[PDB]
């Protein structure tokens, strides 16, 4: 394309990359919290399933 | 001649982007200094003086008319080029044909989003 087409496309992709990096960071934080909260719920749910696999 | 004798005429230049090239060749072989993209300086004039003859005479001058439908050819849709922009700023309306619409099945490819016509309301039948 022409120079302006390339410039606009490059700016758009740079914005997209910035946004995806930020979202990766947010998702990583939420993941850490989710694992932390998943351990106790893991034991709780496994216990609740105990009966059916035992009987 | 037709529009001056009370009749109506329609003229279709096809293309004007090749008249521009022929004019550039002439001007370069007469040794006149080139301009932008090597086109002479008088490349807007070339077309403006030509498309300004498509008038709509009043009833005192016969009432005849001469419509014009110049055809331009862009390069990969670069409407921003030199001759395309000149002729776009010369003409009244536009009819943008796009290859992405041609292959998507829309034929004629007229891009109704960008196509314009200054007359609009006027010059349309009441039912339409």
């Amino acid at each position: 394309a022409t120079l302006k087409d390339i410039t606009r496309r490059l700016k758009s992709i740079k914005n997209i990359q910035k946004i995806t990096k930020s979202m990766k960071m947010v998702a990583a934080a939420k993941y850490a919290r989710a694992e932390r909260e998943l351990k106790p719920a893991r034991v709780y749910g496994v216990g609740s399933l105990a009966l059916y696999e035992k009987a | 001649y037709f529009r001056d004798n009370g009749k109506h005429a329609l003229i279709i230049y096809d293309d004007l982007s090749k008249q521009a090239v022929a004019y550039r060749q002439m001007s370069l072989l007469l040794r006149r200094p080139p301009g932008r993209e090597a086109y002479p300086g008088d490349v807007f004039y070339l077309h403006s003086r030509l498309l300004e003859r498509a008038a709509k005479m009043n009833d005192a001058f016969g009432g005849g008319s001469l419509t014009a439908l110049p055809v331009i050819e862009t390069q990969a849709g670069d409407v921003s080029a030199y001759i395309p922009t000149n002729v776009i700023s010369i003409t009244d309306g536009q009819i943008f044909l796009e290859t992405e619409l041609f292959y998507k099945g829309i034929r004629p490819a007229i891009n109704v989003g960008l196509s314009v016509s200054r007359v609009g309301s006027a010059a349309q039948t009441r039912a339409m």
């Binding site: 410039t7 606009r8 496309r9 490059l10 700016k11 758009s12 740079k14 997209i16 910035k18 | -």
Partner: protein, 47 residues
């Protein structure tokens, strides 16, 4: 060469149209909801 705010919709590529539609559908939905509420309020306030 840098990047600036509101550039995704300046390019007008696929992401630009995708974003425009993602906005328009949502706000058409909310406009419909608000119009329904406006009609309800109109009727309930006649008396």
């Amino acid at each position: 060469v840098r990047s600036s705010a509101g550039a995704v919709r300046d390019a007008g590529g696929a992401f630009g149209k995708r974003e425009q539609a993602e906005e328009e559908r949502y706000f058409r939905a909310r406009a419909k909801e608000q119009l329904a509420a406006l009609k309800k309020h109109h009727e309930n306030e006649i008396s």
